[PDB]
Amino acid sequence: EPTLVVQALKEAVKKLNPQAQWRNPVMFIVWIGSLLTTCISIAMASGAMPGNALFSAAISGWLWITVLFANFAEALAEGRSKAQANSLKGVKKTAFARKLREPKYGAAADKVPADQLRKGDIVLVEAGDIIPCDGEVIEGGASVDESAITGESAPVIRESGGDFASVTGGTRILSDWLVIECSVNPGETFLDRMIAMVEGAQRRKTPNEIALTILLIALTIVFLLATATLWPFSAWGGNAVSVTVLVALLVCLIPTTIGGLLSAIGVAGMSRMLGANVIATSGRAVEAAGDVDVLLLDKTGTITLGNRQASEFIPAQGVDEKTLADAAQLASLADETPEGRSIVILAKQRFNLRERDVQSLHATFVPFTAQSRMSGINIDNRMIRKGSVDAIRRHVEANGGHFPTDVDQKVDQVARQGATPLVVVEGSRVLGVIALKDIVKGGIKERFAQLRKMGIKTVMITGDNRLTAAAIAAEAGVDDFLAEATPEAKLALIRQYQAEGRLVAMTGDGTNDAPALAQADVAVAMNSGTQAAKEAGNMVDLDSNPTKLIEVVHIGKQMLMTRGSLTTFSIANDVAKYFAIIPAAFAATYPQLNALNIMCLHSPDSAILSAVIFNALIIVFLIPLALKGVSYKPLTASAMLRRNLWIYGLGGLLVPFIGIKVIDLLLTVCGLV
Amino acid sequence: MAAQGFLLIATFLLVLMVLARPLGSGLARLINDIPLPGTTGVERVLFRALGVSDREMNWKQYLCAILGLNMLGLAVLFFMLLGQHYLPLNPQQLPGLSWDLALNTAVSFVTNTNWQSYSGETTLSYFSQMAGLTVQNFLSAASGIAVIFALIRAFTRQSMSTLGNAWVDLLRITLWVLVPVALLIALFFIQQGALQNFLPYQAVNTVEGAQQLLPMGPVASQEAIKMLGTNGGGFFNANSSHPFENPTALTNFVQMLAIFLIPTALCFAFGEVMGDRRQGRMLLWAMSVIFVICVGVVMWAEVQGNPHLLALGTDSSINMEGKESRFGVLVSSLFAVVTTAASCGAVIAMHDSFTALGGMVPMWLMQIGEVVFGGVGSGLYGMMLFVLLAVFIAGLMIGRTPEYLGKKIDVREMKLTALAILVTPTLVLMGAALAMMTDAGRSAMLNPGPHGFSEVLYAVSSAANNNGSAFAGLSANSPFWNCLLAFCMFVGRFGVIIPVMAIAGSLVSKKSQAASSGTLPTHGPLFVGLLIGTVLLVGALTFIPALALGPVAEYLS
């Protein structure tokens, strides 16, 4: 909780407008009770009604603090989202654009800010200037630092080739001029869509949150009825219970923990989804991704799914580590595969490899091909192709070069280590081998076994033959594998998996597998221009990782079970709330009821203040759990229910006793009451 | 003492399950629209004569049918009670009832509550007892069993837009499950000492020379339908304490078996018709655990009675006040728990004379919603609402969409379940509040201290939760009391029936999935304990302050 964010969010909180409060019925009831207790306190201070006129004031102040804490939760979640929003948008608020009239560079560069310019224009960007437009490229070439999307700062080639000519967002260029024709208008710009997403928080509630609010409202109704009927019941026996005690019991009984933390949970979970390089338009799709029973992972362009990434560089006899990393960075520069992205990221992390001056090289770049499983460039007359070891062995044996030496025991060593060997070549001489290690610390096999223990099934689709698909399936640990994939075959697979009443979540290409993505219940689209994807739906994956649907399952089950755990906690606290307030509330109506005070508290007003203070402070103490979700252990459904009960139901039955006791002890030592 | 009570609980439970499992199979056959053996051939002729073609109807038509028949019963009973002196079978030539008592009795006997604000033997005639009370005891029970039949059918049927036939359901229930079993029970009651005559009130020359006017009548048949249909509307002032009503301990045992017979058989029928008996055994395990704990607590509280009896020179402190002598204190306690758990107004013992702790647990156990072996079908769909809450909470815990037995639970089901669970506690709370803010409600009082508020709260809970068991010290013959309790009975039964019917009509439109490893099972000790915790925790969160101002304050006093 950094101060420069928390203070500004508290400043946003301080507007306690009733219009912003009545959308949440639980804390609108709490707000109404707070205003009622405040008015009672002012009337008692003026002289309208007798009594303490300070106990009521303290109760009203702490109820106002409860309302402010719920608003602190909601605005803290909104500010945590808006920090990541302004980490990308804030550069483009104060910038400039270089306009042009013709695609030729040899023209007068017109100076227009172009912050509201329509589509179909022509602009220019050069020498580290921020790209202000989102369109296509007809000519030019430069290295582009996609920090605003990737978050790892890695150069990509943006040249007119057919697929590598699509800029996105306010993204930093690094080499030289690159003419751009923006094909969108503001509002459908990527940064504008992220603005609409971060300002689109809790505009439409998900069905899970709607049903949870229905249950919370029903609990609010029964608690309100009991509290309101206590005055006629206790007015007959002795003097009536004071109204401020009734309002304190009402607020302290109503579930205000989950009631104030629900929107915080939703916004923080969607912020966590945004931090996982996933563009989700609505949270209903995220909840469905948490709700599915089978997972389909389309491997057609990537290599060994997406868990395997670059770990370390193994050189050769006739090359140096710096030269090997230079060749690998130049080869994988023109690769949007997660493997090539990992190669670029590892090279940057090792030797700080940067801008390469692609236009001075004058090399035409060939991207990754699904059938060839190859990716390389055309510098001068040599090929810097790289890929799988069998494919590159076929490539080097297709020419007159001699077969490489010691690479067999090198790839044997990395296979004994347990990594996929990625090999680069200069055209005739093998320049080394790269070990692709799994990025999951616990292991992708253990993660898939945990998914199996969760009851959710994992299936991957491979475009290669039966042997490669079986090998990758045995290496990963999946349940079913497919070979020779066609869109008709995958649509039929989705239909026959849905035929047994199961929900299908499938990730794949948004441009090649769009009907099957629409057929699937959840669609984590990847490798797209993202414009029509976000228009149609089709939850956009940024770094095109096929295994991030597991990450959505994590962030899309964690939110739901955090909601359930906090709901059960807020329900279960009320037993200790009874044991604290009921003897305090009925101290004068029935003095025999002091035997129910099982905890040795001092005075009834001290008990009421202690219970109200704990009810206020539990929201602050559960801020980190609501922001981070729950660190949950993937097991069977019965085991998860048992663990969640043993943690949160027993917490709700135990820790309010301890908290009320220690708050009353602190009050008695400090002498306020 | 403790061994005798445990033996009584165990014997009653095992005999109940043994006698109720074949009735569970019979109710399963009625649910699956399969005619009973020996009934077809004349059932078709009866439906052809009655103009029912067994046409399937949806939830709107089905609920409208049941509600219209209930209004017809209410109107017929109200006119019969107003004009009972014109009707025959008047041994004492009793006058017609007042408007408030007639309306309260009509609403009470149509809403399967059977609250009595009067003395039967000096209020109602033989024709009134024979027709307007027994017919309503059949019809309200048949309506409840029909509602739970349609709910079980909604849980079975996959993507259909209809539920069943209301007239076929009520006719089958009344003619096959109700009339023969109540006939056997009434024949056993006449085997014991119970009235099934129509003689006038026989004057008795007492041995010491006093005068006794014995109230003869057709008592045994009304007893049998009262016990079988979980009704509780007695012939006399004492709903089951009268020796013309319960002459023997065997008769009392048959009474408790007949009370718990149809909820147990309906749980067994649910378990059989779902295909998996584990859900019915889950419901039975939860209700049996709560019931055993409640009987143990009430038996201990009645054994550890008042110390005033020991102080004023008696050989034992057992609270025998307000209890019959032919049945023990343990039997009276067990019947009190049975009748306050299963929505039955019949009482062996006067519940005012119970200890505060032994009268709290009947009160709380009927305030939770009357769901532990409750009503006749009524407690089973009360369990359905509570297990909908339980499966929603458990689905939230496991991170998946809630799903009870294949069908997912959505916003509309959540709204209707929340409303149905809201309906009866709000009636209890505002009815008791309105009774405590009016001198008309505070003038009918009998006992002082917190026991008086206990009496008021118990009466309002009896009206709203369709029990009819009364703290008999409260004088509910006031017009304000009659109107308030009648409103509570009406809104309670019909505003629980309507939203659970909308729940059934929402559930028929859904298709059940396949039970995967990721789906939470709805059986086992974990889910039984979760459902028990849900029911007791909701009942506590609704009624701990009221019980603290009433029976808890009395017990600590």
Partner: peptide, 27 residues
Amino acid sequence: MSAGVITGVLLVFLLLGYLVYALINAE
């Protein structure tokens, strides 16, 4: 009854009506 009692009862009824309306709605 009295002014405070009747305004408390009416405020409870308006709060109950607002909560029932919120339960009926999905926002």
